[PDB]
A paper describes a structure:
Here, erythrocytes infected by late blood-stage parasites adhere to placental chondroitin sulphate A (CS) via VAR2CSA-type P. falciparum erythrocyte membrane protein 1 (PfEMP1) adhesion proteins. VAR2CSA-type PfEMP1 are ~310 kDa large, multi-domain proteins embedded in the erythrocyte membrane. They are composed of a short and conserved intracellular domain, a transmembrane domain and a large, polymorphic ectodomain. Extensive efforts to resolve the molecular basis of VAR2CSA binding, established the CS binding site to be contained within the region spanning ID1-DBL2-ID2.
Comparing the PAM1.4 Fab VAR2CSA complex structure with structural data of APO VAR2CSA (RMSD: 0.909Å) derived here at a resolution of 3.12Å, did not indicate major conformational change to the VAR2CSA core structure. Alignment of the models shows no major conformational changes on VAR2CSA upon PAM1.4 Fab binding. In comparison with the APO VAR2CSA structure, we observe stabilization of ID1 (N521 –K522) loops upon PAM1.4 Fab interaction.
Residue numbers in the entry: 1 to 415, 496 to 541, 554 to 694, 699 to 714, 716 to 735, 749 to 1059, 1092 to 1990
Write the structure that this text describes.
């Protein structure tokens, strides 16, 4: 044993392992993890995520694969002249017989491997990976053999060839020789530069000895790369003996006889032998195997005798015809056999030179490694291990040699084809099943025959725990891809066939091979099926069933499907018998049915797997045998179950969930029976338990939370239900992701944003491909994206338990970790280790609704609100969300926020200033002020809308937190009272700071600062305090001057009303007396006989009035809105008159006279409006262009009198009161005559009291309550007018009992609304005219509006007459509208003109005011006719490529992207099925996204479908190009950083691309003025609206994704076209800047789009991190004390003020935004389409908390692709992992891990982290000084705004 050598077979693994001698191989192994492989489109992260999916995109695309030899395919085959010749030197026609041994490798097209920049191991191994992947694909996919036990040997041969190429030992080398010397020299020169990292001290550099170490170091990587493409049925290592072998060794892992693909270690140790000798197997073994196959396979028996009938052809005639007509002309083809059997023996005939050591006629290259065979094989003993004798397979072809004699006998005797198609419908659910399913195949060739119903025959001859364990490494388990994922059922591991190592052991009576024919094989399979049925009959009945068969039928179905998967080879689980039964099955199915395997290159069978799948699809006989086997039979309960087509993982999931549900029902029945209070769970709180019902709840909790042994039921393995469910969810989401990223599937209808696919393969209409990926793809688009939804769909109903606990919902609780093992000792590891929050679907520790019904007592009204989560909890210790800690004393009541611990440490403080706890109180209080103001504003408007639809949740979850927030405001004001009391010392010292300024004053500052921050771009712009005329609203919102901020909360809490109430209500009273109005003879009114302001009534036209805009001489400056023509022609009655200048007819009378005058005036004007709208003479009344007869409103009576009478009432009201802009007849005299002449001395008496003083402020406040006396008259008139025209049969009503609405207080807004409605109606009429003009002059001859060139197809009068009037109308209306929108926005603030107009009138939905009245000269140039330019300007919009006379500058353009916009929650979609309140925020980049080009085409293509798609595609491409160009212009030149700017710009462009894709697919979360109409019209176009909404969305998604456009350049989908357009825009920007094209954005493949909310969240996180870093660095550079003192330093205490103010102002709204984002995430994560709040799925989100998800995403460094966010030292301190290691004290490190200090996200927003705690005091005091100064400024500003009473 002392003569051990180093040959590395089985014993040199631990003794001879000298590879890892020094720390060099660890860095020598190649890890291709560098981002952006060249500029062709490679990426490191894609390769790291999966090594098996490497493509040619890692270098120049489409032009790399070995052996660039240009042999053209379809003219010749096997024609080469390369090697040598002697007589025909011109070429090499035929001088050597090259075998097809290596010529069949992936060696055909485009080995253009010459490019440079390959410098390191990352770039070095890329070509090796490409070669390995390509050779594996070529050797596996199209393999002419019958898929026998030779694919492993073929892959081994390919790997040996690759190893020889790398080592250079290969002898037959072609064009790769130039690289081989290049690798030996260039890659030597580029790898020897790092002399520090390598120990090449011996001369010279040890090139070979270092490259061999490099290859040994990366031995594994190339192994899994080359084996990536192989199928799981490889079954490597030829030794197939059952659980043993001729070379018995120790137990290491499950190498028997599989698990090499996932082994992560080399299985083939035969490559470590000296490779010089290793190369003999290439010559001999391949010929041996091929000849052994040739001699035996084509034996076609003697069935071609042509006895029954004469046959012209026999299929194979080898001896019957040819050898009878002649002797050997057709059979004597074996001549290559003294190199095989007559050319064989040129291998081992070198024994002539005996005893042969030193070779003198060879080369000297250190041949000591090959000197072994000098004596080892010639004249030495051959007594060694079994690797030479016994282990190799040398006699397996019926060998009967008698080379040895053994007289002793002490051993006992041993003891062309059809291919049908089917569309059987799977029903994997019990609900309505709104969709269907399908399958394929069926053979009708591989079967029994006929004459079914064969029965009888008999007498042919305890793992009961779920193996949820790692992969089968020793005896049992699952597959490597399925390890610890789903768990193996006991029935599945105890099924009969899985226990049989070979199929030939089916029958005990016969003990030899019996499967030689198809029927013979099927007979054994049927025997196995019958045995399984009998075994299940023995097992299940009759203990778990009450005489029925549902359990028995379920077990038979599951076992039937498991047999199907096992015989198909798609089994996901393994035992000791499996992987040998599979090998025997494959050997049988290769020996039998081998002829049908012909379709290797294109009915026949493509491969062996499809053949086996087809055989199994011939399953009715097997199912009938299984069914008849046990007791099911016939005449007791009588089709084929569809359970088998469902994937085995899903079947295992359903079985495990059914087991868990049965156990849960057993454990919850007692809980339901007992936990009732007296007879129901909710009743009496006292003695809720009858005696001790808590024991049942304790049992349930123990069952749920056990570790599999402390009370838990059968199932799992030492792990909780929660852990097992999490593993299941992870595996299921991985399957969903793989299906979505798959390329091949059947016919489906994609309708999800997170989907991409090019081709869908199927042969039948509306059929899925029946594969696992296709089945998961079909699972997608009907929901079912999560296990919760899938199980909710497939489960029966009440099997989950007596309590209805649907799997869709999620219930959260808190629990202690398993008590068997304590993490890192006990009593000091952490607090959360004992308390961890869990959130599964109804796996909670309580039976769903009995969270509070259990453990006695009933849920209080306070905690029911928390359960409903309608009003979330934010603060803890005395709050807007319940609970309080006190105490009523001096110090100190603080409103602590949830989840963050308040730190009262006063060590941060200094002397003579505020205390640390007071500063923390101030910060907490200002945050509380902001958040509570926001929440009151949000929740004050909801009211839940009733009815429809205690009285809802306004008694609970409302009117409770109102009182409790009143209490919280009282607490906060009491605490601030103590805070302000600190002026006993500092008030005189710092007069006048008040130490500090009072609470009401601070609230005033807070609201003013809130206004300034939004409307003046930051609080730092408070110097620009000129608010123009927005003060009135602002002083209304903030109170007149200071010392009234307390009143702000007083009002904001006293207005918590207007609902509940309710009460009953008081409705309904009666109308107001009295009708009368029968005196139609109202005399004549000199004012107006007819309001002919919109022309005259037919007959006769003319006299149209015009909108009196501002700057009119009669109204002075007129800063208000325009005067309506109806108001201009208003029927004043007998009050005002003309012909005498200003005449007041009613001058000496009282108001008693004018009620009759106003009454008959409104009567006549209303009766005219009833006639002014029947004839359509009013602009508001007239709709479309036919008139009011052909086109009429639906509401029973002409549209435009209810609004007209409302406007008349409003303008009469302001006529009495005094309008903002007096109209025409100087209304005021009425406003100073019955308090002067007709407003004169009424009702206040003229008798003065006191005297001159206190006499001029008691008279001017009376006329506000006298205006109500006219609405009754209006009601009487409007009811009376409709009731004379009884000529047609109808009653007098506008649209039924519907009355005119109220809220008639607003007047200028009413005028604006009237103007907007009239403008929209006129625009619709003009649009109809333009469409008519575009349809006319265009006939069947395809004429185009009579256009000639000219300068293209321009209009010259056909539709120009119709469109120029529209153009001038838009011009004048823009003139009127830019002067009204500004006034309305300044008056109301926060309400845009469009968001006011659109909802009040349906006709405004088609108008985008921003685009129509865009203020841009480029807009005027490119859109001469406004939004209808595309209809009129018919130039056939056409997106031009990057080159060949591009037209971008001459094309339509927009403005540059804004850089400092704020996140806004406006324009969020209003989801149907209300109370779906989204808390999301639109990114600035998305809300500034330019899509203005779409809108004209969107308007144009309303009619004329099948033409919209081309125009839409073109405009989308040009928009994407311009968007990429402007985003690059916004990002890249702002700092010329080569990497940061480029990567940030590319990430932003990818985000914009994904947002555009979501807009197209309809998954966008924003409905602004643009995208709302874009989505509406896209829905109208796609599907033509004749389908449903889901169908429309699916059509849109399919159109975006599939290859829809037919182009002459390959088959590029619309998504690819848009990405290419964005790339072209980036190229334009780069060329303009004269830079280099970015390394990223060169990717042709764009990844799967994450959900829009998640992308927005990641963008928000990245922006927040960058802004936080910038602002904190500014603060640390400025607010930190100077190095040369402060008083005498370079600072003036001003730049620190600026930095602190900027930081606080930026951080204040970010907390609210993050709170909203987290609130939405906590309700959206881990949800599918059917359960998420929105329709889109979120199954890819696997993270309990948003912070954890961000840590999983933001931990790394941004690269430009996929990774779009990063965090550096945010929050905590400038140090990342790692500082302290837990290994040195107690294993292991359990964080785990922090992954960047992003967990401080919640704490930093409360200004509580250490980084801000360093500068909190100075920032706070500076903020307070700023507060005082700006109150001074604002008060002075208001006093100056008073202005008027000073001088003239």
């Amino acid at each position: 044993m002392d003569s051990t050598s180093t040959i590395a077979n089985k014993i040199e693994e631990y003794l001879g392992a000298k590879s890892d001698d020094s720390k060099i191989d660890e860095l020598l192994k190649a890890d291709p993890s560098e981002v952006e492989y060249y500029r062709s489109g490679g990426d490191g992260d894609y390769l790291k995520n999966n090594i098996c999916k490497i493509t040619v995109n890692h270098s120049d695309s489409g032009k790399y694969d070995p052996c660039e030899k240009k042999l053209p395919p379809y003219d010749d085959n096997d024609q080469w002249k390369c090697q040598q010749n002697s007589s025909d030197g011109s070429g090499k026609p035929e001088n050597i017989c090259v075998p097809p041994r290596r010529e069949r490798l992936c060696t055909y097209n485009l080995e253009n491997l010459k490019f440079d920049k390959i410098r390191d191991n990352n770039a070095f191994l890329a070509d090796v990976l490409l070669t390995a992947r390509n050779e594996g694909e070529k050797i596996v996919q199209n393999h002419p053999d019958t898929n026998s036990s030779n694919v492993c040997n073929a892959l081994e041969r390919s790997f040996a060839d690759l190893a020889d190429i790398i080592r250079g030992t290969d002898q037959w080398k072609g064009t790769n020789s130039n690289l081989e010397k290049n690798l030996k020299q260039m890659f030597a020169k580029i790898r020897e530069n790092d002399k520090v990292l390598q120990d090449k001290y011996p001369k010279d550099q040890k090139y070979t000895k270092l490259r061999e170490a490099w290859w040994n170091a990366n031995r594994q990587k190339v192994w899994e790369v080359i084996t990536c493409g192989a199928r799981s049925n490889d079954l490597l290592i030829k030794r197939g003996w059952r659980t043993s072998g001729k070379s018995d060794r120790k137990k290491n892992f499950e190498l028997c006889r599989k698990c090499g693909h996932y082994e992560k270690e080399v299985p083939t140790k035969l490559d470590y032998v000296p490779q010089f000798l290793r190369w003999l197997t290439e010559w001999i073994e391949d010929f041996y195997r091929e000849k052994q196959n040739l001699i035996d396979d084509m034996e076609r028996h003697r069935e071609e005798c042509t006895r029954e009938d004469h046959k012209s052809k026999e299929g194979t005639s080898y001896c019957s015809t040819c050898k009878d007509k002649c002797k050997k002309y057709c059979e004597c083809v074996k001549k290559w056999k003294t190199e095989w059997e007559n050319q064989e023996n040129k291998y081992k005939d070198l024994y002539e030179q005996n005893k042969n050591k030193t070779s003198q006629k060879n080369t000297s290259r250190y041949d000591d490694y090959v000197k072994d065979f000098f004596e080892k094989l010639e004249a030495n003993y051959s007594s060694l291990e079994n690797y030479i004798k016994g282990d190799p397979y040398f006699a397996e072809y019926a060998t009967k040699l008698s080379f040895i004699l053994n007289p002793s006998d002490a051993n006992n005797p041993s003891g062309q084809d059809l291919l049908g198609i089917l569309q059987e419908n799977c029903s994997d659910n019990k609900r309505g099943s709104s969709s269907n399913d399908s399958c394929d195949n069926k053979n009708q060739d591989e079967c029994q025959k006929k004459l079914e119903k064969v029965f009888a025959s008999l007498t042919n001859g305890s793992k009961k725990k779920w193996i949820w364990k790692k992969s089968s490494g020793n005896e049992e388990g699952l597959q490597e891809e399925y390890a610890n994922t789903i768990g193996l059922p006991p029935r599945t591991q105890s099924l009969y066939l899985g226990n049989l190592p070979k199929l030939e052991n089916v029958c005990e009576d016969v003990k030899d091979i019996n499967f030689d024919t198809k029927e013979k094989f099927l007979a054994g399979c049927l025997i196995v099926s019958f045995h399984e049925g009998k075994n299940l009959k023995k097992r299940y009945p009759q203990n778990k069933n009450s005489g029925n068969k549902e359990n028995l039928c379920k077990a038979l179905e599951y076992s039937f499907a498991d047999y199907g998967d096992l015989i198909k080879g798609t089994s996901i689980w393994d035992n000791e018998y499996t992987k040998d039964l599979e090998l025997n099955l494959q050997n049988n199915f290769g020996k039998l049915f081998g002829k049908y395997i012909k379709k290797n290159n294109t009915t026949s069978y493509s491969s062996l797997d499809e053949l086996r799948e087809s055989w199994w699809n011939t399953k009715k006989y097997i199912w009938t045998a299984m069914k008849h086997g046990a007791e099911m039979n016939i005449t007791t309960c009588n089709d084929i179950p569809t359970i088998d087509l469902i994937p085995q993982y899903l079947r295992f999931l359903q079985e495990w969930v059914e087991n868990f549900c049965e156990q849960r029902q057993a454990k919850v029945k007692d809980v339901i029976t007992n936990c009732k209070s007296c007879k129901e769970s909710g009743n009496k709180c006292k003695t809720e338990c009858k005696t001790k019902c808590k024991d049942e709840c304790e049992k349930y909790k123990k069952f749920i939370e056990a570790c599999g042994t402390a009370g838990g039921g059968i199932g799992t393995a030492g792990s909780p239900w929660s852990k097992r469910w999490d593993q299941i969810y992870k595996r299921y989401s991985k399957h969903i992701e793989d299906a979505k990223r798959n390329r091949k599937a059947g016919t489906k209808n994609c309708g999800t944003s997170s989907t991409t696919n090019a081709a869908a393969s199927t042969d039948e209409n509306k059929c899925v491909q029946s594969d696992i990926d296709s089945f998961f793809k079909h699972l997608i688009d009907i929901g079912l994206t999560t296990p919760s939804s899938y199980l909710s769909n497939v489960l029966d109903d009440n099997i989950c338990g007596a309590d209805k606990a649907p799997w869709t919902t999620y219930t959260t609780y808190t629990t202690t970790e398993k008590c068997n093992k304590e993490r890192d000792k006990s009593k000091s590891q952490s607090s959360d280790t004992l308390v961890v929050v869990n959130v599964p679907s109804p796996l909670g520790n309580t039976p769903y609704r009995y969270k509070y019904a259990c453990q006695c007592k009933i849920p209080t009204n306070e905690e029911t609100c928390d359960d409903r989560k309608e009003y979330m909890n934010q603060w803890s210790c005395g709050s807007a969300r319940t609970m309080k800690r006190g105490y009523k004393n001096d110090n100190y009541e603080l409103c602590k926020y949830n989840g963050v611990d308040v730190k009262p440490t006063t060590v941060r403080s200094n002397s003579s200033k505020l205390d640390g706890n007071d500063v923390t109180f101030f910060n907490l209080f200002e945050q509380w002020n902001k958040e509570i103001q926001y929440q009151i504003e949000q929740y004050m408007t909801n009211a839940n809308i009733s009815c429809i639809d205690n009285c809802k949740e306004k008694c609970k979850c409302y009117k409770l937190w109102i009182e409790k927030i009143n209490d919280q405001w009282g607490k906060q004001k009491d605490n601030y009272n103590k805070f302000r009391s600190k002026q006993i010392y500092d008030a005189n010292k710092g007069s006048q700071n008040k130490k500090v300024v009072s609470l009401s004053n601070f609230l005033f500052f807070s609201c003013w600062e809130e206004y300034i921050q939004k409307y003046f771009n930051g609080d730092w712009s408070k110097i620009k305090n000129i608010g123009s005329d927005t003060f009135e609203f602002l002083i209304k919102k903030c109170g007149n001057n200071s010392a009234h901020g307390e009143e702000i909360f007083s009002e904001k809490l006293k207005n918590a009303e207007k609902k509940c109430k309710e009460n009953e209500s008081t409705d309904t009273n009666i109308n107001k007396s009295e009708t009368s109005c029968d005196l139609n003879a109202t005399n004549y009114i000199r004012g107006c006989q007819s309001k002919t302001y919109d022309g005259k009534i037919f007959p006769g036209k003319g006299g149209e009035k015009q909108w009196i805009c501002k700057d009119t001489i009669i109204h002075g400056d007129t800063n208000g809105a325009c005067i309506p023509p109806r108001t201009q022609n208003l029927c004043v009655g007998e009050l005002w008159d003309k012909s005498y200048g200003g005449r007041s007819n009613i001058k000496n009378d009282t108001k008693e006279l004018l009620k009759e005058k106003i009454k008959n005036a409104i009567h006549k004007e209303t009766e005219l409006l009833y006639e002014y709208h029947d004839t359509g003479t009013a602009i508001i009344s007239k709709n479309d262009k036919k008139g009011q007869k052909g086109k009429n409103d639906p509401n029973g009576l002409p549209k435009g009198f209810c609004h007209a009478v409302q406007r008349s009432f409003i303008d009469y009201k302001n006529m009495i009161l005094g309008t903002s802009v007096n109209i025409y007849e100087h209304i005021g005299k009425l406003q100073e005559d019955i308090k002067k002449i007709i407003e004169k001395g009424t009702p206040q008496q003229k008798d003065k009291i006191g005297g001159v003083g206190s006499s001029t402020e008691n008279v001017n406040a009376w006329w506000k309550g006298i205006e109500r006396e006219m609405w009754d008259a209006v009601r009487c008139a409007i009811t009376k007018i409709n009731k004379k025209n009884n000529n047609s049969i109808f009653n007098g009503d506008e649209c039924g009992v519907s009355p005119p609405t109220g809220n008639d207080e607003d007047q200028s807004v009413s005028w604006f609304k009237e103007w907007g409605e009239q403008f929209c109606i006129e625009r619709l009429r003009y649009e109809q005219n333009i469409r008519e003009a575009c349809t006319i002059n265009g006939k069947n001859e395809k004429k185009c509006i009579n256009s000639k060139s000219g300068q293209g197809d321009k209009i010259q009068g056909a539709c120009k007459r119709k469109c120029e009037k529209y153009k001038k109308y838009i011009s004048e209306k823009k003139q009127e509208w830019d002067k009204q929108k500004t006034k309305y926005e300044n008056k109301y603030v926060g309400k845009s003109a469009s968001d006011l107009l659109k909802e009040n009138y349906p006709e405004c939905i088609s108008a985008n005011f921003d685009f129509i009245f865009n203020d841009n000269i480029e807009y005027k140039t490119y859109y001469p006719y406004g939004d209808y330019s595309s209809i009129c300007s018919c130039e056939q919009v056409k997106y031009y490529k990057y080159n060949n006379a591009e037209k971008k500058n001459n094309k339509s353009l927009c403005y540059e992207k804004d850089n400092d916009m704020t996140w806004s929650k406006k324009y969020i979609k209003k989801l149907e099925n209300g109370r779906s309140l989204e808390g999301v925020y639109v990114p600035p980049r998305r809300q500034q996204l330019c899509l203005y080009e779409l809108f004209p085409i969107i308007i144009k293509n309303e009619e004329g479908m099948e033409k919209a798609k081309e125009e839409l595609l073109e405009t989308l491409q040009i928009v994407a190009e311009r968007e990429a160009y402007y985003l690059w212009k916004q990002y890249n030149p702002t700092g010329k950083g080569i990497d940061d700017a480029n990567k940030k710009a590319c990430c932003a462009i990818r985000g914009s691309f994904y947002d555009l894709e979501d807009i197209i697919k309809g998954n966008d979360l924003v409905h602004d003025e643009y995208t709302k109409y874009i989505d509406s019209k896209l829905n109208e176009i796609f599907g033509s609206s004749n389908t449903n909404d889901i169908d429309t969305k699916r059509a849109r998604t399919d159109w975006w994704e599939n290859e829809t456009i037919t182009n002459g350049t390959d088959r590029k989908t619309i998504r690819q076209l848009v990405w290419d357009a964005m790339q072209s825009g980036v190229r334009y920007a780069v060329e303009e800047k004269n830079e280099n094209f970015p390394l990223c954005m060169g990717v042709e493949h764009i990844g799967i789009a994450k959900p829009q909310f998640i992308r927005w969240l990641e963008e928000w996180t990245n922006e927040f991190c960058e802004k936080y870093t910038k602002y904190f660095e500014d603060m640390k550079s400025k607010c930190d004390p100077p190095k040369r003192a402060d008083t005498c330093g370079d600072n003036s205490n001003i730049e620190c003020k600026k930095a602190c103010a900027n930081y606080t102002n930026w951080l204040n709204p970010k907390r609210i935004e993050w709170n909203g984002m987290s609130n939405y995430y906590n309700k959206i994560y881990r949800k599918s389409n059917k359960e998420s709040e929105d329709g889109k799925d979120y199954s890819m989100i696997m993270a309990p908390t948003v912070i954890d998800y961000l840590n999983k995403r933001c931990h790394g460094e941004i690269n430009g692709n996929y990774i779009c966010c990063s965090c550096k030292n945010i929050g905590a301190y400038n140090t990342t992992s790692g500082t302290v290691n837990k290994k040195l004290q107690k294993k292991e490190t359990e964080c785990e891990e922090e992954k960047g200090p992003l967990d401080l996200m919640n704490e930093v927003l409360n200004k509580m982290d250490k980084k801000y705690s360093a500068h909190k005091m100075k920032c706070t005091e500076v903020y307070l000084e700023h507060v005082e100064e700006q109150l001074n400024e604002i008060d002075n500003a208001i006093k100056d705004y008073k202005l008027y009473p000073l001088d003239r």
